[PDB]
Assembly symmetry: D2
Homo-oligomer: 338 residues x 4
């Protein structure tokens, strides 16, 4: 089992990433917001005595200079780590990062943006390809009771019984996208409510795990790697999560896949060594390791954490850190003095 | 001076309006959200022993069946009120309402929606016409120091000195509209931040009055009647507010004014008995009465109040009620049992 | 049914009483703390259009110049009230007050002090004599399941099942008094915890009604009139409360009853028209009216409300107001400007 | 400079100590409450890779089996630490502990109890003898403006100007002890307020450093080692603290010093190598090292942190951790699952 110290240091990782990204809040520059976050997250991780590999991040080493897929992070990745690192610290771990989950939200001062990461031992986090993903997220009472393969209407009926709430008081977060017109209409027809977001379905899935938030499920199609980070959260909190890769451009209806074809995408999946493109992944398959760590820090306001607030001489952050190793859910409000 | 009891009853007015509107949260129906709110606000006001006239509301008596301009509300508007009402309760008062400020926000589960009203004695609230309005809102330290007639860049410079904050840490809420491209760019060029909202500039202006919110000013062009409600808030809290009517379709660039002309609009202003179309209105001119009451209750989450939350058997509301008569700012968290 | 307006005005009654009492916080003068509270509560009640009679208060008209038993309060107690008051406002109501519950706590800066009152229609609040009272208070899950006639050990066993908590994690508030040595020891022997208070068993009983407080029951012997105010709270919140008068000086062991005898006290009870001195009163017997109102405002910090905080130019209060008529539990945080 | 990791691990040290001590909350056993705390604090510290020496603790090695003065704590105190520890981790540091500050408060369910520690590099924390100590604590605005050598009346006058508050709204915490009759009376005579506590003057001094608490100074005579822990807090937060040893039994008036004499105590001070018994120690002299760490976790409720709350399957803690090395003040709310 990995070093317990890591579950503490990641507090500072998401804090520093959030602070740096928040420096570009409402500046209208999604690139600078991402770059500051990515830079601050990496540098803080590279001060941890850990032996880490990025398995979800900014993109392939070609497509992304920093926190690329397969990048080594932590002091103990160094060739002579045996001089600086305990056996414990030498344990290999996989890391999924999203330094600024919802860069558009941070750029235009929109709620829902977070610095987020997940950690497990090697092989313990699914290395999702850069694909879309059908997601179903729901609270702990609903775990294994709802199912991604059910209709939205059936899932709401089940969720209603699980949470002991009328169906017309269930709140489903759905991403505002042309791909979701039918889904959205269905939820309405069922009698439930639809909370539309422009970006940031990770803070959405995470809200499902907590009572107090007025969020009871996430439905629809999001980005796959972000799905894995959400799954890691749910596994740690005992909430429901399932994901299924989406590869057909006719389903997702975006400009990103305007010059993509279903078959071309299928072959890309084969190249990734994915043999079952239609597979439904349980939370325990997406985050499958012995130990799961999850950390988040608010950039703009969300339902669980406030955004970063600056003041003369400093900043104030709110963070959520979850460890299956220490069995703790830890809310952290930090005043940073500059 | 009006009955002190009114400053208490309006707690229940905005609560009931918010609850009713929240029943349509995320239902995708901006009409039902408005109608429930309007209906619940009016009925709760009609149980108050007050002699009220609506001066800002849903529209003219022709254009709006409920809470129309000039509608009488309160038990003491009845012809035989002298049998039911104290002299005190017989005092004539003017009321500005927005039962669901940001109906689109409530319909699609977006932050920033509130049930809101303002009250003063007769003649004490400007009866704004259904026009656009250039608005400048800012915290109490900035009152009378910034000015609507200044450039955004000069106003930020001044605001910087007032709040003792670097300019690059000032947050200006601006409505996302084509009319604001130049304004938005200017604020960026100045070095400050722009928080874009899709609707709801009343909760924006109100956030300016409170430290803790990360909102330091509102700039740009909004709707005039909503401006008056915001001015009433600021006058009560001692925050800055100024408004100036906008009448030229080339400036506002909307489909609502696509078949409108500058001159046609100017003549409409004359018909309203407005002789100076270019007048800058101080907060004290928009809300000019001896006594000002202001009440708000969150429908969806904002920076000051949570949205309405429903649970098995009830709902929970958060409200803000301000009285220059009792000199109180009153935050109210209510659990309603059904 | 009484005027709904009263359930709003009492917010201001407990606020004003608390503020006035808080002016003597930590001044070491339990008399001034009481007198300011009593004075401020009465004056604010005398501005309500209600027809009230004090049935629990500072003492008999001889023993207490202000808020004495049988004193008339409210504008509609006046002989010519028919000129000022609606039929509704003319309804007769009984009021129980404790303007400063725990004057010693306020005098020495101790937690647990509150301004508190309860209202019902005439005959609806038991007019307890100035006697001690065995009390059992417990949360809603425990209502009618525990019983004052059971041993503390049996009641803890039952409470354990009701709240789904180990017995060694139940917290019983008990007053630190020689009369409770055996009771206290019993609770320990049972395995549970004892939270000792020096004064103020009303805020204790009220804490039992709320999850979040770490208080799960009140046991032991307190003052009877304060018991009735607590019962009114519980009936409104659906929590458990029972009371039984204690009249035997050998049981209570105080200096107040050093020159009292069991038989002399029994005869005093007869004079009050109490025929069953050993009667166990249900919550519904102590507060038996159709409508129950309950209001509290913190003077020093408690588990539900902060104490009054003063600042340059004003004060900040926190209040709890409960109405079976509007079916609302209402937490109120007020900033008062002077 | 010491390992930054230590400023994170101490979060868990005070949490574990608090949880263990809270298991005896309201059990009436000040010994078990202390022993659980002491045991849990030591064991959690002995899992940190640090090279620590206890300089303030349970007592001398003879008088106290656990966390005694001079005890080595941390993995890097081991003779072969060079095999397990970085140079950084091998740095010598001094630690002051109070695993349960106010054991009486925890035993009887009283507010004000905390698990607390302070850390600096070797020589950086004054090794106070087991003596009483005159203390003056006050907020940052008052730092170096008030003075322990002034009368309480002069200090209040100065504090009044510093905080911009009327003197009659200043709150001085003073310990309820016969030794303080004259002090207490003086503060009243000055016009200010006295908040009496039975134990726990560390949480009192710490409250002075924060606005929001209604505590503006600590005055009077407390225990010396606890004074040093408080000084460490103030130095980190920039609040005022001064201490002066009290050695004369006629001044302190306790049973602990009933068979002590002034001269006997003076000679004890000489044996400790203290040459100036009348010395006034600045905060920077009591906590004089380059780096200061301070950690606290609530056991029973205080003004900054809630006490430990238990629930079916776990506990919830609130902690405050301050580091001059990371320049952070960090509030931590942790849900522990068992
Ligand atoms: O290609 P589109 O239509 O934008 O959808 C991808 C979106 O990217 C985010 O919103 C942000 O990275 C992310 O939170 C979601 O996973 C979402 O699906
Ligand atoms: O005509 P558009 O371009 O929509 O602008 C009017 C908008 O209406 C609201 O957003 C909502 O009623 C309101 O909060 C604002 O005043 C705003 O200006
Ligand atoms: O006669 P004692 O031994 O003091 O007991 C009476 C006490 O009075 C209060 O503590 C305060 O009025 C009150 O909250 C309680 O009812 C308590 O019993
Ligand atoms: O000898 P007494 O009269 O008890 O005074 C010592 C007290 O011990 C504590 O209250 C608790 O350890 C501690 O918080 C204080 O320092 C206090 O002075
Ligand atoms: Mg990216
Ligand atoms: Mg991403
Ligand atoms: Mg996108
Ligand atoms: Mg409308
Ligand atoms: Mg409107
Ligand atoms: Mg519009
Ligand atoms: Mg009394
Ligand atoms: Mg009393
Ligand atoms: Mg007494
Ligand atoms: Mg000890
Ligand atoms: Mg101690
Ligand atoms: Mg002692």
């Amino acid at each position: 089992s990995m070093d317990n110290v890591i579950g503490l240091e990641i507090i500072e990782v998401v804090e520093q990433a959030a602070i740096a990204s928040a420096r570009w809040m409402g500046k209208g520059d999604k690139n600078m917001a991402d770059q500051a976050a990515v830079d601050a997250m990496r540098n803080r991780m590279n001060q941890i005595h850990m032996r880490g590999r990025i398995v979800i991040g900014e993109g392939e080493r070609d497509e992304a200079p920093m926190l690329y897929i397969g990048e080594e992070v932590g002091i103990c990745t160094r060739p002579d780590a045996a001089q600086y690192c305990n056996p414990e610290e030498l344990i290999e771990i996989d890391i999924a990062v999203d330094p600024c989950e919802g860069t558009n939200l941070c750029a235009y001062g929109q709620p829902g943006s977070m610095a987020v990461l997940a950690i497990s031992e090697k092989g313990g986090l699914f290395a999702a390809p850069d694909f879309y993903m059908k997601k179903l997220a729901a609270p702990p009472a609903a775990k294994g009771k709802v199912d991604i393969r059910n209709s939205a209407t059936e899932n709401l009926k089940i969720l209603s019984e699980c949470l002991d709430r009328a169906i017309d008081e269930l709140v489903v977060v759905v991403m505002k996208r042309d791909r979701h017109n039918d889904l959205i209409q269905e939820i309405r027809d069922a009698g439930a409510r639809v909370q539309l977001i422009s970006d940031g379905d990770v803070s959405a899935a995470l809200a499902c795990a907590f009572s107090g938030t007025n969020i009871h499920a996430l439905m629809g199609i999001g980005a796959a790697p972000e799905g894995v980070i959400s799954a890691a959260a749910m596994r740690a909190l005992g909430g429901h999560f399932q994901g299924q890769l989406v590869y057909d451009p006719a389903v997702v209806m975006t400009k990103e896949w305007a010059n993509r074809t279903r078959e071309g995408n299928l072959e890309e999946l084969k190249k990734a060594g994915i043999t079952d493109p239609d597979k439904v992944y349980e939370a325990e398959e997406l985050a499958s390791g012995e130990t799961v760590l999850f950390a988040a820090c608010g950039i703009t306001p969300g339902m669980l954490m406030k955004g970063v607030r600056f003041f003369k001489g400093g900043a104030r952050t709110q963070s959520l850190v979850i460890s299956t190793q220490s069995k703790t859910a830890r809310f952290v409000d930090t005043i940073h003095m500059f």
